[PDB]
Amino acid sequence: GLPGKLADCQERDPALSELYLVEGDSAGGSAKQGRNRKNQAILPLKGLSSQEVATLITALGRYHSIIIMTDADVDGSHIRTLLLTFFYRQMPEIVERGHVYIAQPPLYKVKKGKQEQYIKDDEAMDQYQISIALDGATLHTNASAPALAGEALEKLVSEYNATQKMINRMERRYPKAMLKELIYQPTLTEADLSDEQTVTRWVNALVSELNDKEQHGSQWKFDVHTNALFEPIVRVRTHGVDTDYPLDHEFITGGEYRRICTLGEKLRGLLEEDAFIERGERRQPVASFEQALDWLVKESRRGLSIQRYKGLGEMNPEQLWETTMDPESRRMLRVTVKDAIAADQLFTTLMGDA
Amino acid sequence: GLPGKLADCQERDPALSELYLVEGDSAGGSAKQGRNRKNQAILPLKGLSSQEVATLITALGRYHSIIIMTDADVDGSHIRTLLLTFFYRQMPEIVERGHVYIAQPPLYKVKKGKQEQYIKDDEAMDQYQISIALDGATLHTNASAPALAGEALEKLVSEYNATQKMINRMERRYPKAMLKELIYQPTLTEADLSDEQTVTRWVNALVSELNDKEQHGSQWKFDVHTNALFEPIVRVRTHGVDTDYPLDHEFITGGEYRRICTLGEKLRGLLEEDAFIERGERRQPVASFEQALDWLVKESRRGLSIQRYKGLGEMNPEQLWETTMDPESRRMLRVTVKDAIAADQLFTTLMGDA
Amino acid sequence: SSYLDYAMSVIVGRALPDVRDGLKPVHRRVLYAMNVLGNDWNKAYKKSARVVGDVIGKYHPHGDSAVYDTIVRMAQPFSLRYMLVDGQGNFGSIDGDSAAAMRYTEIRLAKIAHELMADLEKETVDFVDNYDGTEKIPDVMPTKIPNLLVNGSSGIATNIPPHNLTEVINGCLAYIDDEDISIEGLMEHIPGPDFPTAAIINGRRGIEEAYRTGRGKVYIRARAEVEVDRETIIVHEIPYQVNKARLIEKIAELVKEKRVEGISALRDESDKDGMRIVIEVKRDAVGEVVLNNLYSQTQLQVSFGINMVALHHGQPKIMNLKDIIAAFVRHRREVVTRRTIFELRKARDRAHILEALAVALANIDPIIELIRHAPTPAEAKTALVANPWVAAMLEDAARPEWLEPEFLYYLTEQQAQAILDLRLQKLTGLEHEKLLDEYKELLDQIAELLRILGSADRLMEVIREELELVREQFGDKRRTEITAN
Amino acid sequence: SSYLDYAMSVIVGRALPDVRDGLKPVHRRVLYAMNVLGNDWNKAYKKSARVVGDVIGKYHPHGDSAVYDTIVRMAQPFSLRYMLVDGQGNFGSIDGDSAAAMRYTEIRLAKIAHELMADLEKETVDFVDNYDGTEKIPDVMPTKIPNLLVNGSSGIATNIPPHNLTEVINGCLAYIDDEDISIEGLMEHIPGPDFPTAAIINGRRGIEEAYRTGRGKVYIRARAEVEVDRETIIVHEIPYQVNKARLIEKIAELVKEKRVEGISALRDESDKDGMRIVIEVKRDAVGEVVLNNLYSQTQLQVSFGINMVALHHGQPKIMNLKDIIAAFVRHRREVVTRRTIFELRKARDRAHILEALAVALANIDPIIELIRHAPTPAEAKTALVANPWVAAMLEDAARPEWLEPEFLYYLTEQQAQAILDLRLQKLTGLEHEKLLDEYKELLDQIAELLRILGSADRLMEVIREELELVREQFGDKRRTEITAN
Numbered sequence A, B: 001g002l003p004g005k006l007a008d009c010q011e012r013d014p015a016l017s018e019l020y021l022v023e024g025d026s027a028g029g030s031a032k033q034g035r036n037r038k039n040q041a042i043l044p045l046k047g048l049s050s051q052e053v054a055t056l057i058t059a060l061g062r063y064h065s066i067i068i069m070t071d072a073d074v075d076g077s078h079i080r081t082l083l084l085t086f087f088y089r090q091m092p093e094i095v096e097r098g099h100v101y102i103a104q105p106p107l108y109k110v111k112k113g114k115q116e117q118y119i120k121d122d123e124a125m126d127q128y129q130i131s132i133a134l135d136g137a138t139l140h141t142n143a144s145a146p147a148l149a150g151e152a153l154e155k156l157v158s159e160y161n162a163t164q165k166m167i168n169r170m171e172r173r174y175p176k177a178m179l180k181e182l183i184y185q186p187t188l189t190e191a192d193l194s195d196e197q198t199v200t201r202w203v204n205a206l207v208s209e210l211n212d213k214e215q216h217g218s219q220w221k222f223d224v225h226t227n228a229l230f231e232p233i234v235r236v237r238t239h240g241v242d243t244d245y246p247l248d249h250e251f252i253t254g255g256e257y258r259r260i261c262t263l264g265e266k267l268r269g270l271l272e273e274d275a276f277i278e279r280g281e282r283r284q285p286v287a288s289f290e291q292a293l294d295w296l297v298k299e300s301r302r303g304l305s306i307q308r309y310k311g312l313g314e315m316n317p318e319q320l321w322e323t324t325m326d327p328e329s330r331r332m333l334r335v336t337v338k339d340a341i342a343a344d345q346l347f348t349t350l351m352g353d354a
Numbered sequence C, D: 001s002s003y004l005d006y007a008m009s010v011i012v013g014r015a016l017p018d019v020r021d022g023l024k025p026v027h028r029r030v031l032y033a034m035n036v037l038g039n040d041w042n043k044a045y046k047k048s049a050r051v052v053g054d055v056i057g058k059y060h061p062h063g064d065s066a067v068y069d070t071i072v073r074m075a076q077p078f079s080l081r082y083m084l085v086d087g088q089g090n091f092g093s094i095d096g097d098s099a100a101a102m103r104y105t106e107i108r109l110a111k112i113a114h115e116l117m118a119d120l121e122k123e124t125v126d127f128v129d130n131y132d133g134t135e136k137i138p139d140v141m142p143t144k145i146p147n148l149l150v151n152g153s154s155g156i157a158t159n160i161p162p163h164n165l166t167e168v169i170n171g172c173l174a175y176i177d178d179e180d181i182s183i184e185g186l187m188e189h190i191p192g193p194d195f196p197t198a199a200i201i202n203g204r205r206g207i208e209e210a211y212r213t214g215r216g217k218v219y220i221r222a223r224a225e226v227e228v229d230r231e232t233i234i235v236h237e238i239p240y241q242v243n244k245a246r247l248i249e250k251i252a253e254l255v256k257e258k259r260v261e262g263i264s265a266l267r268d269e270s271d272k273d274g275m276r277i278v279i280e281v282k283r284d285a286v287g288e289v290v291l292n293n294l295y296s297q298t299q300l301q302v303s304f305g306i307n308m309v310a311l312h313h314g315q316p317k318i319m320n321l322k323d324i325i326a327a328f329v330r331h332r333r334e335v336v337t338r339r340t341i342f343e344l345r346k347a348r349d350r351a352h353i354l355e356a357l358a359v360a361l362a363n364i365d366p367i368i369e370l371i372r373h374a375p376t377p378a379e380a381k382t383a384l385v386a387n388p389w390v391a392a393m394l395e396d397a398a399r400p401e402w403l404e405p406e407f408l409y410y411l412t413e414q415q416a417q418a419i420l421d422l423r424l425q426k427l428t429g430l431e432h433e434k435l436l437d438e439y440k441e442l443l444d445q446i447a448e449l450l451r452i453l454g455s456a457d458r459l460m461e462v463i464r465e466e467l468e469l470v471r472e473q474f475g476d477k478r479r480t481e482i483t484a485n
């Protein structure tokens, strides 16, 4: 029957009680040793859908808020997919009314000294690294703004990273190393292109830099194409094969190269080359702004440890409580009828034929 | 049907053909890649007795000499037991007529230089170590026989080992270390017991030796019991507990202590303490005969390697051929109706209830 | 003997534990693998898969899911009264819920396990070959804990219940003062079993009978209380080796067939605070009449057929309480002795090495010249060998028994290479004085070790000190109750 | 992207091989585990269990029987055209007989596998984390063999047949001389697939179509001959990926239902001399009429649907013959370059260390004094740091690019400890001259490495030399026959 397979709760009123759904092998036990008897009920499942199980879940319900605890990985998360697709198909309305949710176990556990922290996302993990890095940090330049910190610094750091992200998003089209150097090199103007002497010396300065900085076995060269409008060209020999990259009139006109220049404009305006960075007790002179940011991060991480979770079973029942099922701590996520739809589709996709 | 499960042979006449029976997982494959198509047929079995299999074996037979290839270990050899017990029960006459045999894979593989050797038993492995050790060996003593070798030496070495074997067979009753020293110490006589002064000094000499030789944390002591007939007693404190061993009138009269004395008599007659042993190019002076025998064995083993087999699957099909199924090389063993009887009993024993 | 007597002798070798450390081959391999790995209690957690592989690879290559289960059970609080494995993650429940995948769960040795394998490096136990013959495994663990009594065992035969460490350490100390003490003198410290899952033992005759003849049948009952607010039964603890979930199914089935009566609501409210089974008595029915009716038809009451069988000398024996205690104390004596002898030998060998190093410094310059002279190390070595070279400090004990009488101060071939091996950092005038300390401190140690080996009562005092250290560090309160009525 | 696009991107990550070394994560882990173990071709055999555990423990903890099967298949002569694993023991048969237990079978790396992972230590490939993050695994193997072509692959999708190494090495060398060569220019060296289990390929259009469009369907037929003495059919070799035993059952079933006719005796005479299937034609029946009737109803004839799909840049691609060859040659360039750069760096760092050691000897006595002076090594160290100390030999290349301009001869903190670490044996006047050789020989090497990195055609000459070394050492005869008719 039902008793022996389900671990019910004291609460008798639906909409005041929540039913957890886990994979026996992953959290079946830990969930039970860490739940709260008052309002948390636990139904372990095993499956790829057991029919007896499917009659147990039906005979179960009662409970208004039903949580699905399952690993994020493709292999383990299947049990979640089978549920969503079974819901959408057999029970459409239950998903629509917002009764079904999806537990969101932390992806990280950061701890500095006595303090520990549970971070949900890789986006939140990024927000946390920036936060630490910046806290207590101030950048002393010789420019109009002797000290750059607080909200102002965050603006800079954000722009700098935004550019490096875009760089990596356009990496296949142009060498990552080159775009990084356009940031430091003076901007090339639509008007500048019309002149050849300025254009040639420019692309010469660029290439001349890349070569001196290159640690890997690569060879940079420059060439200027004459267009009846002068257009620079950067040829790179790597590894044994040389490819050439044209700086089209479009490129110099493109918003992508503008965001690179604007960044360089701010950086060059802040006299970054010569500066001091403190965070926050100590400081060290930096030759570049990125060298200052690398240093910030080296400080922020000095005494902390970071643990990544790959599965629920990695943590004790107590830990599982503090992270996933403690009302105050937990970070749940409700599923939409559009999400159950996608879970039905995925199940069918895996089922090439049936 | 039959084809696909059995690998038959060219030979059509029973009593001119042999059927091998193996455990698929152990030798199923290797047997087939190493057999001789002419007269060797192979029937792999898996099981704990498959019924389809049992109808395949019946539908099989044909073949006069049927070999059972199976590991010696208790876990793997079960398939052999199931066969013998099935034979005895269902087919009594086939075992009685001497049609069923049992392959005897080597327990060792010794190789010196280009030479390799396959040794069947631990008894044969002992005969081989002695053989090597003695080959080219001669013991030079100062006694009436300047040089002791050949058949004469074998006699000595055999007696010496026979005594050490008996010693280990009576080890629980008396300390192994003590009995070894009775060999070197002068014999105690029934007549000697009647005198106390001689008996006391004797057991004093014994104990005094054991203590000087003891490397472990043990303490030897002597005591003489007066019997209205004097009987020595050796008390040993080990580890923190002391036990005492009485040299009863029976002991001194016993054949066991006689074999120890006779050995010592020969050894003491051969002036073993001072001697030379050569085997055979070089030689080294020895303080004891056992020190000479240890040296022999240290020589014999110097350049050889020894591989012990635990399972058939440990060796390639070619190797399996040269050892177990090559008519000239192989060493088979026929089973008696009395052996099938014991295999029926064993099966039943494991089957506490059915 | 017959092939049958051997086949029976090996099947019994796997099934029975060793009276000395209550461990079977599987457990002893798994634990030793953890120790070699450096998977200590004070080091970071390691994934179960890491250990399971190491075991499968070197010591016990017979199924990954088998080896893991072994580690699991040694981690669970409900199956072992004193866990030998420290585990973080989902390790299964009393309900029978499985443990998480071996790649997710994390484990390291418990503080108590380091005591089980205390003095394992010092040649205190015999070593056997592994399956392939490339590795060596302990024939037994040099244990400071009487595990066979403490944690017990099960035969698939023998059935030994766990016992409180504190009680047992006492009983052991009692056997140490008087070797002749009776089973009733022991039962003054060891009243009975002490299961991890605390419960109530009703009969005291069964335990007295089992400590005396090695065999007996004892009663175990669930700790249930009746509660008002209608009427409800609440179980705080259940009998050892009892699956709580299947227990629940059973009661539900009984009420279905109506073999038991007076139950309206049966729910499992077990949570992070502890175990809690709820049975709401129906109206027109008594709670304790329903309870006793349950005891009579339910796994709530279980008789534990004690059958203390364990391999003493590689041979099966049915032993009473005293026999098990004595065996642990003989084992301690042996480990303690063998330990000392090894410690002494090592001390000798280290003091011998030091003497060469110390003499080297005083005569260092001439040596340095020699080193510069001979192109080949062996040629400079031979030079050091040819001519012999803190007098109060030097004044024979330090020298190993194996060392010849011959070896101014005489040098060994090995010592010559030791002087050649010494680095340039040791040359400083501060290392000389430091080494002088180690040397002198080792003399005081060898002298102490000799005092131990000689005095038989001294060895029995060190053993008693070790047992006390165990009772304090790892001792805890009782959990099951014995109520003879 | 959507959760579905990711879930599909990971399922495809396990299923497809990497064009560069034709290995899937499982194979690359298993092989790397063997290399770390020191399980070389020239070392003793190690039990399979030993490797399986190491893999399960550190790199791929997903079932022991899964990891073993992987090692098995890499050992079998009938499944791999060029075995990467050397195995001794029962490793299963073409019939489908399983391999022996992992505790019995023995294995070590094949000579060819050491080439697959040649230059793996020198930072020539990227490294990824393991499941727990305690170990690092190569993202790909720095292979000298075009395995994806040589040994092929299978998708549970992609289907690539094995190829002769000699042919392929040629085709690679042909692509090296002219980057623009056509698929027909390649097919001058690579006529077609070359299965481990030799057989007859009847159609040549399918292979030409597959080398051109990456997709095609080819015919494979058993090599059967009719024999007199009545009439009997004898199969010497069968189609790749064909279970011989089930083939036999099939023919027996066909004759039962009488879909095929003219067979009186069907026996499997396969033995240590090779494969031998016997089918005795009945009287009143033709042998080759029975044979062709078999081809038509039997697995004796099998069409091999080539479908060359493989992950180029972590992304799935359908590639023709040339695309696969080019990818191997770009991979070689990268490995060769990255190798050099590392070799150069290491040479620099070693020459830099040497310079300090050499200078130390000439000024050795003053140093020795200093060492005697300062009690603490760091105090003697600081002393060495304070004052700077074979001129022709010294005459900047040797110095690493990272080394500052500042560092008489200047010393590094690390170098100070290196002089302090040096042992007394190195002091001999023969070690000085020996070190002088290593130093000078490294200069000649760094100079050579620089010559390589500069000259782009030089790098393409070393690659060609490596391919030739592979074709000679591991090249062998063809086995399957192509008969376009």
Ligand SMILES: [Mg+2]
Residues within 6 Å of the ligand: C062
């Ligand atoms: Mg076993």
Ligand SMILES: [Mg+2]
Residues within 6 Å of the ligand: C236, C273, C274, C275
């Ligand atoms: Mg409680």
Ligand SMILES: [Mg+2]
Residues within 6 Å of the ligand: D062
């Ligand atoms: Mg997987």
Ligand SMILES: [Mg+2]
Residues within 6 Å of the ligand: D236, D273, D274, D275
């Ligand atoms: Mg052939």
